C-alpha cells in the first residue's frame, strides 16, 4: 500500500513575523526551497471572515475519472450546484464510500484509497471538482474594499492584510485569485506555475487538502521520470498540455530517487509553493480553497 512521503515544513510565525508575507517567505526560503512546498499557520487570533456571495454562488464542476490514464465521451453528465447542494453531494459521497461519518475517516485512509483508485482497473470511481472558478464571479473568499459587499469594522483588518490573497504582488518586472470547491478524491495533477511563479494557497474552510511537493532542484529528475513512465501518446506533448494529465503516484517518483514531501493543509492554513516546485494533491472532503501566483 501507499507509503506517505515525509512531511514538509510547517511554520507558526509570531505576530511580529506575520507582519510582512514577502519578508517572511524570504526568511524561510533556505529551508522551504529545499522541500518545494511549505505550510504556514497564522497566529491563533487571525481569523478572516468568509466573504463570497453565498446566496448566488452556483457552478458546474468538472468530472474527474480517477483511473482515466490506467484505463487507456458521455460517462457522466454534471449537475449544476450551489455551495450548499455541492456540500450535501460531497458529504453523502464520502460517508457512503467509507460507511462512516465524514469527519471520522482517517486522512491516511483517504490517501491510501485515492492512490489505489488512481491505478485500479477493476473499480471506476468518478468525482466532481469545482475547480478554477474566478474570484471575479462571486467575489473572493477574503473581504475586499471594492464596495461590492459590506465590510464590518472587525473585518477591515483582513481586507487590508498582506496575507489576503487579493493584496499579494502579481506584476513581474519586464491576475486575480482562483477558487477551488473540493470533495473527497477531487484532485490536481503534477505541475509547475506559469513563468515558474511562486504560488500561495489558502484553505478557507472544510476538510483538509492533501499536498505533495518536489523541490525545484529535482525538477529535471521529475520530468525525466514522467517521460519514462507517462503514456507515450502524451509524452511527446508540450509541457503546458502534458500537465493536464501528469498524474503519478508519489511512491513511483520516490522509487526513482525524486524527493517528495507531503502535507495536510487544514482550514485556515496557507501553503506556499516555491519557483519551479512541482506539486500535486487531492481533497479529503468538502472544502473551499483560494489560490494566486505572486511575484517577489
Ligand atoms: O486544486 C488545488 O487546490 C490546486 C492547488 C495548487 N495548484 C493547482 C490546483 N488545482 C488546479 N489548478 N488548475 C490549473 C492551474 N494550473 C495551470 C494550468 C495547468 F497547466 F493545467 C496546470 C494547473 C487546475 C485545473 C483543473 C483542476 F481540476 C484543478 C486545477
Ligand atoms: Mn499550482
mmCIF file of C-alpha atoms and ligand atoms in Angstrom:
data_model
loop_
_atom_site.group_PDB
_atom_site.id
_atom_site.type_symbol
_atom_site.label_atom_id
_atom_site.label_comp_id
_atom_site.label_asym_id
_atom_site.label_seq_id
_atom_site.Cartn_x
_atom_site.Cartn_y
_atom_site.Cartn_z
ATOM 1 C CA UNK A 1 0.000 0.000 0.000
ATOM 2 C CA UNK A 2 0.881 3.671 -0.266
ATOM 3 C CA UNK A 3 3.868 4.869 1.802
ATOM 4 C CA UNK A 4 3.338 8.528 2.866
ATOM 5 C CA UNK A 5 6.210 10.859 1.883
ATOM 6 C CA UNK A 6 7.942 12.781 4.664
ATOM 7 C CA UNK A 7 6.231 15.876 5.975
ATOM 8 C CA UNK A 8 7.079 19.298 4.530
ATOM 9 C CA UNK A 9 7.955 22.171 6.906
ATOM 10 C CA UNK A 10 5.220 23.906 8.896
ATOM 11 C CA UNK A 11 5.848 27.393 10.199
ATOM 12 C CA UNK A 12 3.960 29.096 13.028
ATOM 13 C CA UNK A 13 5.018 32.757 12.750
ATOM 14 C CA UNK A 14 4.723 35.052 15.717
ATOM 15 C CA UNK A 15 2.676 38.212 15.265
ATOM 16 C CA UNK A 16 5.952 40.039 14.519
ATOM 17 C CA UNK A 17 7.000 37.557 11.810
ATOM 18 C CA UNK A 18 3.450 37.608 10.408
ATOM 19 C CA UNK A 19 3.601 41.371 9.632
ATOM 20 C CA UNK A 20 5.013 41.072 6.089
ATOM 21 C CA UNK A 21 4.376 37.985 3.910
ATOM 22 C CA UNK A 22 7.141 38.528 1.359
ATOM 23 C CA UNK A 23 9.656 39.224 4.087
ATOM 24 C CA UNK A 24 8.618 36.089 5.947
ATOM 25 C CA UNK A 25 8.698 33.921 2.813
ATOM 26 C CA UNK A 26 12.117 35.350 2.031
ATOM 27 C CA UNK A 27 13.388 34.387 5.504
ATOM 28 C CA UNK A 28 12.060 30.804 5.371
ATOM 29 C CA UNK A 29 13.408 30.255 1.838
ATOM 30 C CA UNK A 30 16.669 28.485 2.817
ATOM 31 C CA UNK A 31 14.610 25.611 4.220
ATOM 32 C CA UNK A 32 11.384 25.776 2.219
ATOM 33 C CA UNK A 33 13.057 25.907 -1.196
ATOM 34 C CA UNK A 34 14.692 22.538 -0.334
ATOM 35 C CA UNK A 35 11.241 20.983 0.119
ATOM 36 C CA UNK A 36 9.323 22.821 -2.693
ATOM 37 C CA UNK A 37 6.256 23.404 -0.545
ATOM 38 C CA UNK A 38 5.678 24.595 2.990
ATOM 39 C CA UNK A 39 2.701 25.217 5.251
ATOM 40 C CA UNK A 40 2.169 28.411 7.230
ATOM 41 C CA UNK A 41 -0.183 28.543 10.249
ATOM 42 C CA UNK A 42 -1.253 32.112 11.058
ATOM 43 C CA UNK A 43 -1.442 33.287 14.658
ATOM 44 C CA UNK A 44 -4.366 31.788 16.566
ATOM 45 C CA UNK A 45 -6.313 35.060 16.630
ATOM 46 C CA UNK A 46 -6.028 35.659 12.840
ATOM 47 C CA UNK A 47 -9.448 34.543 11.508
ATOM 48 C CA UNK A 48 -10.748 36.219 8.330
ATOM 49 C CA UNK A 49 -14.488 36.065 7.690
ATOM 50 C CA UNK A 50 -15.663 34.213 4.607
ATOM 51 C CA UNK A 51 -16.710 36.811 2.061
ATOM 52 C CA UNK A 52 -18.045 35.106 -1.077
ATOM 53 C CA UNK A 53 -21.591 35.856 -2.232
ATOM 54 C CA UNK A 54 -23.012 32.583 -0.874
ATOM 55 C CA UNK A 55 -26.644 33.135 -1.906
ATOM 56 C CA UNK A 56 -25.774 33.328 -5.615
ATOM 57 C CA UNK A 57 -22.738 31.002 -5.689
ATOM 58 C CA UNK A 58 -23.540 28.488 -8.429
ATOM 59 C CA UNK A 59 -21.303 26.373 -10.610
ATOM 60 C CA UNK A 60 -20.967 23.268 -12.759
ATOM 61 C CA UNK A 61 -17.919 21.310 -11.526
ATOM 62 C CA UNK A 62 -15.825 19.210 -13.846
ATOM 63 C CA UNK A 63 -15.956 15.442 -13.790
ATOM 64 C CA UNK A 64 -12.764 13.612 -12.777
ATOM 65 C CA UNK A 65 -12.314 9.893 -13.535
ATOM 66 C CA UNK A 66 -9.604 8.779 -11.103
ATOM 67 C CA UNK A 67 -8.244 5.923 -13.216
ATOM 68 C CA UNK A 68 -8.535 7.582 -16.657
ATOM 69 C CA UNK A 69 -4.860 7.090 -17.557
ATOM 70 C CA UNK A 70 -4.675 3.484 -16.397
ATOM 71 C CA UNK A 71 -7.865 2.810 -18.356
ATOM 72 C CA UNK A 72 -6.023 3.619 -21.634
ATOM 73 C CA UNK A 73 -17.200 10.604 -24.043
ATOM 74 C CA UNK A 74 -20.596 10.543 -22.299
ATOM 75 C CA UNK A 75 -19.802 8.793 -18.978
ATOM 76 C CA UNK A 76 -21.248 11.330 -16.519
ATOM 77 C CA UNK A 77 -23.494 14.375 -17.040
ATOM 78 C CA UNK A 78 -22.658 17.062 -14.481
ATOM 79 C CA UNK A 79 -25.282 18.843 -12.424
ATOM 80 C CA UNK A 80 -25.186 22.490 -11.564
ATOM 81 C CA UNK A 81 -24.809 23.040 -7.826
ATOM 82 C CA UNK A 82 -24.915 25.699 -5.166
ATOM 83 C CA UNK A 83 -22.338 25.630 -2.430
ATOM 84 C CA UNK A 84 -24.890 24.027 -0.205
ATOM 85 C CA UNK A 85 -26.044 21.411 -2.691
ATOM 86 C CA UNK A 86 -22.467 20.510 -3.658
ATOM 87 C CA UNK A 87 -21.648 20.082 0.016
ATOM 88 C CA UNK A 88 -24.615 17.727 0.504
ATOM 89 C CA UNK A 89 -23.473 15.723 -2.530
ATOM 90 C CA UNK A 90 -19.869 15.652 -1.315
ATOM 91 C CA UNK A 91 -20.650 14.557 2.217
ATOM 92 C CA UNK A 92 -23.121 11.891 1.056
ATOM 93 C CA UNK A 93 -20.481 10.553 -1.348
ATOM 94 C CA UNK A 94 -17.774 10.249 1.262
ATOM 95 C CA UNK A 95 -19.903 8.892 4.120
ATOM 96 C CA UNK A 96 -21.384 6.292 1.711
ATOM 97 C CA UNK A 97 -17.954 5.367 0.323
ATOM 98 C CA UNK A 98 -16.360 4.755 3.727
ATOM 99 C CA UNK A 99 -19.538 3.760 5.694
ATOM 100 C CA UNK A 100 -18.762 6.226 8.472
ATOM 101 C CA UNK A 101 -19.281 9.906 9.313
ATOM 102 C CA UNK A 102 -17.150 12.098 7.080
ATOM 103 C CA UNK A 103 -15.120 13.642 9.917
ATOM 104 C CA UNK A 104 -14.203 10.199 11.256
ATOM 105 C CA UNK A 105 -12.409 8.897 8.158
ATOM 106 C CA UNK A 106 -8.618 8.878 8.827
ATOM 107 C CA UNK A 107 -6.651 11.172 6.472
ATOM 108 C CA UNK A 108 -4.235 8.278 5.914
ATOM 109 C CA UNK A 109 -7.076 6.027 4.740
ATOM 110 C CA UNK A 110 -8.389 8.558 2.237
ATOM 111 C CA UNK A 111 -4.833 8.974 0.915
ATOM 112 C CA UNK A 112 -4.222 5.214 0.563
ATOM 113 C CA UNK A 113 -7.624 4.733 -1.114
ATOM 114 C CA UNK A 114 -7.060 7.643 -3.517
ATOM 115 C CA UNK A 115 -3.836 6.205 -4.898
ATOM 116 C CA UNK A 116 -5.305 2.696 -5.047
ATOM 117 C CA UNK A 117 -8.212 4.044 -7.113
ATOM 118 C CA UNK A 118 -5.947 6.006 -9.478
ATOM 119 C CA UNK A 119 -4.264 2.746 -10.529
ATOM 120 C CA UNK A 120 -7.317 0.462 -10.344
ATOM 121 C CA UNK A 121 -8.637 -1.234 -13.466
ATOM 122 C CA UNK A 122 -11.344 -3.141 -11.567
ATOM 123 C CA UNK A 123 -13.150 -0.159 -9.965
ATOM 124 C CA UNK A 124 -14.017 3.135 -11.722
ATOM 125 C CA UNK A 125 -14.577 5.970 -9.229
ATOM 126 C CA UNK A 126 -15.782 9.298 -10.641
ATOM 127 C CA UNK A 127 -15.897 12.544 -8.632
ATOM 128 C CA UNK A 128 -16.511 16.251 -9.328
ATOM 129 C CA UNK A 129 -14.333 19.291 -8.677
ATOM 130 C CA UNK A 130 -15.399 22.933 -8.695
ATOM 131 C CA UNK A 131 -12.013 23.971 -9.987
ATOM 132 C CA UNK A 132 -10.691 27.255 -11.433
ATOM 133 C CA UNK A 133 -13.670 29.383 -10.512
ATOM 134 C CA UNK A 134 -12.666 33.032 -10.904
ATOM 135 C CA UNK A 135 -12.820 35.252 -7.811
ATOM 136 C CA UNK A 136 -14.432 37.830 -10.146
ATOM 137 C CA UNK A 137 -17.618 35.718 -10.466
ATOM 138 C CA UNK A 138 -18.900 35.743 -6.890
ATOM 139 C CA UNK A 139 -16.072 37.508 -5.124
ATOM 140 C CA UNK A 140 -13.004 36.351 -3.283
ATOM 141 C CA UNK A 141 -13.373 34.405 -0.058
ATOM 142 C CA UNK A 142 -11.397 37.236 1.551
ATOM 143 C CA UNK A 143 -13.062 40.598 2.215
ATOM 144 C CA UNK A 144 -12.093 43.231 -0.358
ATOM 145 C CA UNK A 145 -12.570 47.010 -0.288
ATOM 146 C CA UNK A 146 -14.141 47.255 -3.735
ATOM 147 C CA UNK A 147 -17.599 48.343 -2.419
ATOM 148 C CA UNK A 148 -19.368 45.226 -3.723
ATOM 149 C CA UNK A 149 -20.071 43.742 -0.277
ATOM 150 C CA UNK A 150 -20.250 45.300 3.164
ATOM 151 C CA UNK A 151 -17.122 45.127 5.319
ATOM 152 C CA UNK A 152 -17.742 45.169 9.042
ATOM 153 C CA UNK A 153 -15.184 47.163 11.074
ATOM 154 C CA UNK A 154 -13.825 43.933 12.639
ATOM 155 C CA UNK A 155 -13.164 42.671 9.107
ATOM 156 C CA UNK A 156 -11.313 45.681 7.718
ATOM 157 C CA UNK A 157 -8.012 44.349 9.073
ATOM 158 C CA UNK A 158 -8.465 41.322 6.812
ATOM 159 C CA UNK A 159 -9.351 43.417 3.772
ATOM 160 C CA UNK A 160 -6.073 45.324 4.260
ATOM 161 C CA UNK A 161 -3.833 42.392 5.309
ATOM 162 C CA UNK A 162 -0.843 41.480 3.193
ATOM 163 C CA UNK A 163 -1.896 37.795 3.622
ATOM 164 C CA UNK A 164 -5.198 38.493 1.889
ATOM 165 C CA UNK A 165 -4.525 36.862 -1.489
ATOM 166 C CA UNK A 166 -6.013 39.890 -3.265
ATOM 167 C CA UNK A 167 -3.158 42.020 -1.832
ATOM 168 C CA UNK A 168 -0.242 39.829 -2.982
ATOM 169 C CA UNK A 169 2.083 41.390 -5.586
ATOM 170 C CA UNK A 170 1.379 39.918 -9.010
ATOM 171 C CA UNK A 171 3.212 42.146 -11.501
ATOM 172 C CA UNK A 172 6.522 40.805 -12.801
ATOM 173 C CA UNK A 173 9.181 43.262 -13.953
ATOM 174 C CA UNK A 174 9.697 43.375 -17.729
ATOM 175 C CA UNK A 175 -4.125 38.322 -12.268
ATOM 176 C CA UNK A 176 -6.691 37.641 -9.516
ATOM 177 C CA UNK A 177 -7.179 34.675 -7.188
ATOM 178 C CA UNK A 178 -8.933 31.486 -8.308
ATOM 179 C CA UNK A 179 -11.302 29.344 -6.206
ATOM 180 C CA UNK A 180 -11.494 25.569 -5.734
ATOM 181 C CA UNK A 181 -14.553 23.835 -4.233
ATOM 182 C CA UNK A 182 -13.405 20.322 -3.344
ATOM 183 C CA UNK A 183 -14.956 16.948 -2.454
ATOM 184 C CA UNK A 184 -13.318 13.701 -1.405
ATOM 185 C CA UNK A 185 -10.813 12.460 -4.056
ATOM 186 C CA UNK A 186 -11.057 15.583 -6.259
ATOM 187 C CA UNK A 187 -7.519 16.319 -7.308
ATOM 188 C CA UNK A 188 -4.898 18.287 -9.153
ATOM 189 C CA UNK A 189 -2.057 16.639 -11.068
ATOM 190 C CA UNK A 190 1.661 17.417 -11.097
ATOM 191 C CA UNK A 191 2.536 20.852 -12.422
ATOM 192 C CA UNK A 192 4.568 23.985 -12.019
ATOM 193 C CA UNK A 193 3.258 27.520 -12.429
ATOM 194 C CA UNK A 194 3.444 29.738 -15.479
ATOM 195 C CA UNK A 195 6.770 31.646 -15.562
ATOM 196 C CA UNK A 196 7.973 29.372 -12.729
ATOM 197 C CA UNK A 197 5.998 31.613 -10.357
ATOM 198 C CA UNK A 198 5.570 31.245 -6.627
ATOM 199 C CA UNK A 199 2.028 30.448 -5.568
ATOM 200 C CA UNK A 200 0.135 30.883 -2.298
ATOM 201 C CA UNK A 201 -2.925 28.861 -1.367
ATOM 202 C CA UNK A 202 -5.401 29.387 1.486
ATOM 203 C CA UNK A 203 -7.981 26.881 2.748
ATOM 204 C CA UNK A 204 -10.959 28.998 3.831
ATOM 205 C CA UNK A 205 -12.926 26.142 5.391
ATOM 206 C CA UNK A 206 -13.723 22.423 5.189
ATOM 207 C CA UNK A 207 -11.804 19.154 5.294
ATOM 208 C CA UNK A 208 -8.058 19.115 4.562
ATOM 209 C CA UNK A 209 -6.350 19.415 1.211
ATOM 210 C CA UNK A 210 -3.520 16.869 0.911
ATOM 211 C CA UNK A 211 -0.427 18.095 -0.957
ATOM 212 C CA UNK A 212 2.726 16.607 -2.474
ATOM 213 C CA UNK A 213 5.692 18.803 -3.419
ATOM 214 C CA UNK A 214 9.051 18.376 -5.127
ATOM 215 C CA UNK A 215 11.873 20.921 -4.628
ATOM 216 C CA UNK A 216 12.997 22.795 -7.702
ATOM 217 C CA UNK A 217 16.452 21.236 -7.628
ATOM 218 C CA UNK A 218 14.738 17.982 -8.589
ATOM 219 C CA UNK A 219 12.512 19.403 -11.347
ATOM 220 C CA UNK A 220 14.536 17.768 -14.118
ATOM 221 C CA UNK A 221 14.544 14.458 -12.315
ATOM 222 C CA UNK A 222 10.776 14.508 -12.080
ATOM 223 C CA UNK A 223 10.425 15.434 -15.744
ATOM 224 C CA UNK A 224 12.695 12.538 -16.718
ATOM 225 C CA UNK A 225 10.635 10.026 -14.713
ATOM 226 C CA UNK A 226 7.493 11.417 -16.314
ATOM 227 C CA UNK A 227 8.872 10.906 -19.827
ATOM 228 C CA UNK A 228 9.984 7.352 -18.971
ATOM 229 C CA UNK A 229 6.614 6.357 -17.495
ATOM 230 C CA UNK A 230 3.902 8.639 -18.826
ATOM 231 C CA UNK A 231 1.814 7.266 -21.723
ATOM 232 C CA UNK A 232 3.721 7.708 -24.975
ATOM 233 C CA UNK A 233 0.813 9.462 -26.735
ATOM 234 C CA UNK A 234 1.095 12.178 -24.127
ATOM 235 C CA UNK A 235 4.873 12.050 -23.580
ATOM 236 C CA UNK A 236 5.616 13.878 -26.874
ATOM 237 C CA UNK A 237 3.167 16.678 -25.955
ATOM 238 C CA UNK A 238 4.406 20.150 -24.953
ATOM 239 C CA UNK A 239 4.658 20.627 -21.174
ATOM 240 C CA UNK A 240 1.674 23.001 -20.987
ATOM 241 C CA UNK A 241 -0.600 20.263 -22.365
ATOM 242 C CA UNK A 242 1.106 17.268 -20.765
ATOM 243 C CA UNK A 243 0.477 18.970 -17.410
ATOM 244 C CA UNK A 244 -3.253 18.390 -17.868
ATOM 245 C CA UNK A 245 -2.644 14.627 -17.470
ATOM 246 C CA UNK A 246 0.538 14.271 -15.399
ATOM 247 C CA UNK A 247 -0.964 12.090 -12.629
ATOM 248 C CA UNK A 248 1.688 9.985 -10.899
ATOM 249 C CA UNK A 249 1.793 8.163 -7.571
ATOM 250 C CA UNK A 250 4.391 9.877 -5.323
ATOM 251 C CA UNK A 251 5.891 6.480 -4.480
ATOM 252 C CA UNK A 252 6.829 5.968 -8.148
ATOM 253 C CA UNK A 253 8.756 9.260 -8.069
ATOM 254 C CA UNK A 254 10.333 8.285 -4.757
ATOM 255 C CA UNK A 255 11.463 4.908 -6.093
ATOM 256 C CA UNK A 256 13.231 6.766 -8.910
ATOM 257 C CA UNK A 257 15.106 8.945 -6.420
ATOM 258 C CA UNK A 258 12.920 12.070 -6.626
ATOM 259 C CA UNK A 259 12.468 13.833 -3.232
ATOM 260 C CA UNK A 260 8.776 14.236 -2.402
ATOM 261 C CA UNK A 261 7.239 15.943 0.636
ATOM 262 C CA UNK A 262 3.624 15.873 1.758
ATOM 263 C CA UNK A 263 1.282 17.850 3.990
ATOM 264 C CA UNK A 264 -2.359 18.014 5.014
ATOM 265 C CA UNK A 265 -3.445 21.633 4.773
ATOM 266 C CA UNK A 266 -6.243 22.295 7.280
ATOM 267 C CA UNK A 267 -8.775 25.083 7.341
ATOM 268 C CA UNK A 268 -7.178 28.439 7.987
ATOM 269 C CA UNK A 269 -3.657 27.347 6.871
ATOM 270 C CA UNK A 270 -1.568 28.588 3.917
ATOM 271 C CA UNK A 271 0.525 26.521 1.530
ATOM 272 C CA UNK A 272 3.323 28.273 -0.392
ATOM 273 C CA UNK A 273 4.883 26.697 -3.453
ATOM 274 C CA UNK A 274 8.358 27.884 -4.456
ATOM 275 C CA UNK A 275 9.536 28.657 -8.029
ATOM 276 C CA UNK A 276 9.601 25.570 -10.256
ATOM 277 C CA UNK A 277 8.486 23.308 -7.374
ATOM 278 C CA UNK A 278 6.257 20.612 -8.873
ATOM 279 C CA UNK A 279 3.132 19.934 -6.831
ATOM 280 C CA UNK A 280 0.038 17.725 -6.874
ATOM 281 C CA UNK A 281 -2.685 16.854 -4.409
ATOM 282 C CA UNK A 282 -6.246 15.877 -3.608
ATOM 283 C CA UNK A 283 -9.050 16.903 -1.260
ATOM 284 C CA UNK A 284 -10.060 14.851 1.785
ATOM 285 C CA UNK A 285 -13.664 16.086 1.639
ATOM 286 C CA UNK A 286 -15.868 19.141 1.117
ATOM 287 C CA UNK A 287 -13.731 22.261 1.295
ATOM 288 C CA UNK A 288 -13.082 25.686 -0.213
ATOM 289 C CA UNK A 289 -9.652 26.979 -1.288
ATOM 290 C CA UNK A 290 -8.307 30.177 -2.916
ATOM 291 C CA UNK A 291 -5.002 30.426 -4.757
ATOM 292 C CA UNK A 292 -2.904 33.008 -6.604
ATOM 293 C CA UNK A 293 0.514 33.228 -8.241
ATOM 294 C CA UNK A 294 2.672 36.004 -6.783
ATOM 295 C CA UNK A 295 5.915 37.850 -7.630
ATOM 296 C CA UNK A 296 8.834 38.708 -5.294
HETATM 297 O O1 LIG B 1 -6.820 22.273 -6.639
HETATM 298 C C1 LIG B 1 -5.968 22.897 -5.966
HETATM 299 O O2 LIG B 1 -6.105 23.162 -4.755
HETATM 300 C C2 LIG B 1 -4.735 23.363 -6.663
HETATM 301 C C3 LIG B 1 -3.677 23.761 -5.849
HETATM 302 C C4 LIG B 1 -2.496 24.210 -6.443
HETATM 303 N N1 LIG B 1 -2.320 24.271 -7.793
HETATM 304 C C5 LIG B 1 -3.360 23.871 -8.561
HETATM 305 C C6 LIG B 1 -4.573 23.431 -8.036
HETATM 306 N N2 LIG B 1 -5.639 22.993 -8.877
HETATM 307 C C7 LIG B 1 -5.733 23.237 -10.125
HETATM 308 N N3 LIG B 1 -5.054 24.144 -10.831
HETATM 309 N N4 LIG B 1 -5.509 24.055 -12.153
HETATM 310 C C8 LIG B 1 -4.998 24.833 -13.060
HETATM 311 C C9 LIG B 1 -3.863 25.695 -12.738
HETATM 312 N N5 LIG B 1 -2.580 25.203 -13.283
HETATM 313 C C10 LIG B 1 -2.215 25.906 -14.528
HETATM 314 C C11 LIG B 1 -2.750 25.209 -15.791
HETATM 315 C C12 LIG B 1 -2.268 23.794 -15.918
HETATM 316 F F1 LIG B 1 -1.327 23.704 -16.927
HETATM 317 F F2 LIG B 1 -3.305 22.985 -16.309
HETATM 318 C C13 LIG B 1 -1.692 23.288 -14.640
HETATM 319 C C14 LIG B 1 -2.569 23.707 -13.461
HETATM 320 C C15 LIG B 1 -6.477 23.111 -12.265
HETATM 321 C C16 LIG B 1 -7.229 22.665 -13.362
HETATM 322 C C17 LIG B 1 -8.162 21.661 -13.159
HETATM 323 C C18 LIG B 1 -8.320 21.133 -11.890
HETATM 324 F F3 LIG B 1 -9.230 20.168 -11.722
HETATM 325 C C19 LIG B 1 -7.600 21.549 -10.781
HETATM 326 C C20 LIG B 1 -6.669 22.553 -11.007
HETATM 327 MN MN1 LIG B 2 -0.430 25.202 -8.641
#
